[PDB]
Design a protein around this ligand. Structure first.
Ligand SMILES: [K+]
Ligand SMILES: [K+]
Ligand SMILES: [Mg+2]
Ligand SMILES: [Mg+2]
Ligand SMILES: [Mg+2]
Ligand SMILES: [Mg+2]
Ligand SMILES: [Mg+2]
Ligand SMILES: [Mg+2]
Ligand SMILES: [Mg+2]
Ligand code: NA
Lengths: 167, 131, 27, 89
RNA sequence: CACUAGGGUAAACCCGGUGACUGGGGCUAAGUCGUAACAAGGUAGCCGUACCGGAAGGUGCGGCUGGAAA
RNA sequence: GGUUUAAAGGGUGCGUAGGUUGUUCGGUAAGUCAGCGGUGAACCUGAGCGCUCAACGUUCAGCCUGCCGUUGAAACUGCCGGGCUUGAGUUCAGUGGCGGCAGGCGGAAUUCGUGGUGUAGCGGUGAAAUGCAUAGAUAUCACGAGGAACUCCGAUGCGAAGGCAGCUUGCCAUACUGCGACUGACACUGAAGCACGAAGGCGUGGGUAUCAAACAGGAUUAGAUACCCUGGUAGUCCACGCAGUAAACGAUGAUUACUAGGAGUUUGCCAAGCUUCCACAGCGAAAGCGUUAAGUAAUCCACCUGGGGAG
RNA sequence: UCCCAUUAGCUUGUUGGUGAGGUAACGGCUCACAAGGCGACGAUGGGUAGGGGAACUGAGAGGUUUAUCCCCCACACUG
């Protein structure tokens, strides 16, 4: 279902953004074991966007592993100009997101994980709402799947078999 | 049976989700009009009306994109249910998927889509959303 | 299915029934 | 309910056109009333047959719904049938 | 001479207060007596009902698994 | 927005008001749609103008997107009249059952009494004691009496639910399948209300064998108002009448239609109608559900809104 | 055009008629046959409040209040 993309050696414009840092714990007989998990979103300011989770014992190592995983896992999103073709709602775990296209001079009306995802994908005119949990993993995944479920008018006409649906 | 139109939409939706190619529905005049609208707008591959001793059968052949293995129809939603009827004027006609979908609406000029309803300046009962 | 939830209700029922049995036969 | 095919045929011949009309509202109402009376007679002896009760009540409900259909369709037929059966009480 | 505001009378109702004495509850510490539940918590646990005990509780009858072991 | 497990499905039905209503033809115009007309200071929105700017003041264009009146339209809902058979019901046939109520009959086991044989213990526990026994127990044989429960079959099946199991009969009820029969939408749900509703408990009268709350005794313990042992009264049984509760549970309301595979299983002919376990899509926070959904949809009812106080 | 059903029945000029009187005016408004009227589409009773445009607030739906401003109503120590 996802468009997917090979390692973008040519499309090396992938800027990496950090969503959240967490210090998870594991218990053993000796004591407690501490690690670090980072959520990293790589984007080329175009429909290409990837997400990754990097786990390590140190923050730079976790961020690097997240960058690597995000680079490995890439998809393409059908974005026209700085907006989205239509509205779209998505759910992933306890997180629910809703995106609506806005006017050209509106900016991005979102904050946090959704704002990071939208910046990485290169959408600059959208109203975004979160109606579920604020979990970073689920918010990032729900926003990405909302973007992936979109369809431009050309694709709509293509799978409908017609040319102009009075658009 | 409580809502034959919702049942028709549900049959189509379940056939699409299961991946079937042909779905058979009991026939009705409004259902025949809806099937004609769907064929005209290009959501279904073909249809056929069979007049047996019963009320009849509508046989619908669905349209699949061989390029992507994706049906032409994504969402079918019933709007005006028996428990809550919805009527709109031509000025407040809904727009589905920002104009990329259709809204089948019954008007005094007949059963049509929101686009021609707006063009002819007639309102009525919003049957369903398709995209 | 913790158990403490039902333990609290069991305690409350015990107290209420003890109150009633003590109040019986007195007018 | 001492009910058999001969009694059912006699009832259908008495109420409703022809003896083969087992499905007429009048025929059904007559059959329901007959077995209602017989079940009442059975219950007065077997006062603890709570299963024969509520079967009696379901029969009463069926008869009431048929009478309501007769109201909605043809009132004169309802007057005639309740007069001929002595139902209202 | 009727009509009536207002006055007196009685009742009964409603709304409030106070009262010898006599009961629960919440919160804080921790004095005293035990160990009921959480592991098969050392008698599997719990639900309903009845009787009985300084208290957690115990026992009878039916039910449930939101129980091991088998 | 929710209700298997976080708060949240009524114990289960029948049913009043109400809500919803298969298909088709013809009317009507209540809902619905459209046109025209009337009506609806200041403030608030684009453009100006004046306050030296600005608040502000003021003018004009853009809102009137409610209400009322009057003309048309007839797709849908409503109302009226007619038609159809698929839903629903009636009939006929086949098959099936721990389904209900009532009357009869039976054997194993247990308890008590009487008689015969026989004498040093029996019973019980982790170990004991209480207890019963030379004024004759336990054990064994026969006679007599009474109450309660139905081994094997036996894990499935039936019922609205609670529940239903020795055999037999009578009287009822009902499910499923088909009909070349009949009626012709007569349907679904259902606040009130009514009926039924395990065990325990209450009243009156019978009965009272086993077991056994309370109670009494003997043990174990620092104590033991318990767990163990020996007794033992209500109760457990029947008839009638109250009461109306449960972890009354699938912790999952009732209808309707649709949507994959495997493995078993009951019934009348491959196939329904069931009854059980893995498991696609999908759903879910997860455990998990998955054609008997917790999936996809429509109708109606019940219920939830942090914990305690507090049912 | 607000809450309470831990408020379910209320009503005897009360519902209608004939006539008369009275009023600026119709009318049980008042005065001399029939038994009707209102009620789970919430009567009756109890509690609370002047009502709108404004104003504020929110994407909207909506929510809060009517301090100053405008309109309507009620009142002038208590009857
Ligand atoms: K049960
Ligand atoms: K219809
Ligand atoms: Mg207790
Ligand atoms: Mg303990
Ligand atoms: Mg214990
Ligand atoms: Mg005791
Ligand atoms: Mg719960
Ligand atoms: Mg239930
Ligand atoms: Mg419950
Ligand atoms: Na008794």
């Amino acid at each position: 279902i996802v468009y997917n993309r090979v390692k973008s050696t040519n499309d090396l414009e992938l800027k990496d953004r950090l969503v959240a840092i967490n210090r998870v714990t594991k218990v053993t007989k000796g004591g407690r074991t501490f690690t670090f998990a980072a959520i990293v979103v790589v984007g080329n300011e175009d429909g290409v966007i990837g997400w990754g989770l990097g786990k390590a014992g140190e923050v730079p190592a976790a961020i690097a592993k997240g960058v690597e995983a995000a680079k490995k896992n890439l998809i393409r999103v059908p974005v026209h100009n700085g907006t989205i073709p239509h509205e779209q709602a998505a759910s992933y775990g306890g997180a629910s997101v809703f995106l609506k296209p806005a006017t050209t001079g509106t900016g991005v009306k979102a904050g946090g994980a959704m704002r990071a995802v939208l910046d990485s994908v290169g959408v600059t005119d959208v109203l975004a709402k979160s109606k579920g949990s604020s979990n970073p993993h689920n918010l990032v995944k729900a926003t990405i799947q909302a973007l992936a479920e979109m369809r431009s008018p050309l694709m709509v006409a293509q799978n409908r078999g017609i040319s102009v649906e009075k658009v | 049976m409580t809502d034959p139109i919702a049942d028709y939409l549900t049959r189509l939706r379940n056939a699409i989700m299961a991946g079937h190619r042909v779905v058979s529905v009991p026939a009705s005049n409004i259902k025949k009009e809806i099937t004609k609208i769907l064929f005209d707008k290009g959501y279904i591959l073909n249809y056929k009306f069979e007049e047996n001793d019963s009320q009849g059968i509508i046989k619908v052949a669905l349209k699949y994109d061989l390029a992507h293995k994706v049906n032409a129809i994504k969402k079918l939603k019933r709007v005006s249910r028996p428990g809550l009827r919805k009527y709109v004027g031509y000025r407040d006609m809904p727009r589905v998927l920002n104009g990329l979908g259709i809204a089948i609406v019954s008007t005094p000029r007949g059963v049509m889509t929101d686009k021609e309803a707006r063009e002819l300046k007639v309102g009525g009962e919003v049957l369903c959303y398709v995209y | 299915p913790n158990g403490k939830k039902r333990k609290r209700h069991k305690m409350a029922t015990h107290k209420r029934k003890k109150r009633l049995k003590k109040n019986r036969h007195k007018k | 309910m001492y009910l058999d095919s001969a009694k059912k045929a006699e009832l259908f011949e008495k109420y409703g056109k022809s003896v083969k009309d087992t499905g007429s509202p009048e025929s059904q109402i007559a059959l329901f009333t007959f077995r209602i009376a017989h079940l009442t007679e059975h219950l007065r002896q077997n006062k603890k047959d709570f299963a024969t009760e509520r079967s009696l009540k379901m029969l009463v409900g069926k008869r009431r719904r048929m009478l309501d259909y007769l109201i909605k369709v043809d009132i004169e037929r309802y007057r005639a049938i309740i007069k001929e059966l002595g139902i209202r009480r």
